A paper describes a structure:
Despite the abundance of PARP1, most of the PAR generated by DNA damage is rapidly degraded, with a half-life of less than 1 min by poly (ADP-ribose) glycohydrolase ([name]). The radio-resistant bacterium [name] encodes a [name] homolog, DrPARG, whose expression is upregulated after radiation damage, so it might play an important role in DNA repair. Our study demonstrates that DrPARG is involved in catalyzing the breakdown of endogenous PAR and DNA repair in [name]. From observing the structural peculiarities of DrPARG, we show that although previously thought to be an obligate exo-glycohydrolase, bacterial [name] could exert both exo- and endo-glycohydrolase functions.
Therefore, we attempted to obtain crystals of DrPARG in complex with ADP-ribose. Crystals were found in several similar conditions, but they belonged to different space groups. Notably, the 28 N-terminal residues of these solved structures from different space groups, including P21, [name], P3221, and P212121, were not well defined in the electron density maps, which suggests that this phenomenon did not result from crystal packing. In fact, the missing residues located in the intrinsically disordered N-terminal region of DrPARG and might be highly flexible. The structural flexibility may reflect the multiple space groups observed in X-ray crystallography because packing patterns are constantly influenced by the flexible regions during crystallization.
Author numbering: 29 to 281
């Protein structure tokens, strides 16, 4: 049988096209300053942090460090990707494959460009069925998921180095659209993290700086709470450390 929650989530899945960029900037603008935003950096998975936020989050959203060209990443390379962790534990794949999200994949593929495009998919009330360990949750917990691909900085470096000056501007403006989806959908709690910093090989300090700059500027006080849940099993914890250091000025009471 189709799992509970899936049908309603798929039918409510929505595409944000690049032409919505100003609508997202306006939504951020209208919401800036609403709260004293609290921030934190944790070493949790995206869904551990979401499940810990749920009970006291009015509208909870999380970022999917998405593939531009295949729902769920096509399930290639293994279980170190965040997006495959999301599709393993939740109904997200059933949303990403929806007919209305298909332009995101078709256009990004048609771009023949490792910066990808400014399409974003919004997936309402995605049910989380399992925890990090794969055990069945007694009750699925719903989360709203924003799907956006960071620029593929590894592929720029190796395949089209004349786009190298475009990686950070791309990352910066698309991070702006992610927050703008969240503000347009009037989300209070956001689970962010090291978007683009593994398979896509973006620089962790650069990505956390870009989220810092936005949460101190255009998106300042637009959200109740922001969690940078940064899973990092590398020996020196360089990703988690880069986020912790770069986001120490924001994560203050
Ligand atoms: N469940 C997790 N939760 C939180 N953080 C995680 C998790 N898993 C990894 N991280 C950390 O977050 C960092 C980034 O996670 P990555 O998945 O590489 O994001 P990208 O945007 O650079 O690659 C996206 C591509 O890879 C996928 O296949 C997509 O389909 C795309 O094709 C990791 O280094 C971890 O430290």
């Amino acid at each position: 049988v189709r799992l509970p929650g899936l049908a309603a989530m798929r039918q409510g899945t929505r595409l944000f096209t690049p032409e919505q960029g100003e609508d997202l900037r306006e939504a951020l603008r209208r919401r800036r300053g609403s709260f004293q935003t609290t921030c934190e950096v944790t070493s949790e998975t995206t869904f551990a942090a979401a499940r810990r936020l749920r009970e006291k989050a009015s509208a909870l959203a999380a970022l999917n460090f998405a593939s531009a060209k295949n729902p769920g990443g096509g399930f290639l390379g293994g279980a170190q990707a965040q997006e495959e962790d999301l599709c393993r534990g939740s109904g997200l794949y059933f949303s990403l494959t929806s007919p209305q999200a298909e332009p995101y994949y078709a256009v990004n593929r048609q771009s023949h460009s490792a910066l990808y495009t400014d399409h974003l998919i919004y997936s309402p009330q995605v049910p989380i069925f399992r925890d990090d360990a794969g055990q069945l949750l007694p009750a699925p917990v719903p989360v709203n998921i924003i799907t956006a691909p960071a620029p593929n900085a590894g592929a720029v470096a190796q395949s089209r180095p004349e786009q190298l000056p475009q990686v950070l501007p791309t990352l910066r403006e698309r991070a702006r659209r992610v927050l703008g989806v969240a503000a347009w959908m009037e989300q209070t709690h956001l689970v962010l993290g090291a978007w683009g910093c593994g398979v896509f090989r973006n620089d962790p300090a650069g990505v956390a700086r870009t989220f810092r700059e936005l949460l101190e500027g255009e998106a300042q006080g637009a959200f109740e709470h922001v969690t940078f849940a940064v899973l990092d099993n590398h020996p020196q914890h360089p990703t988690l450390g880069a986020f912790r250091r770069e986001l120490e000025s924001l994560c203050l009471p």
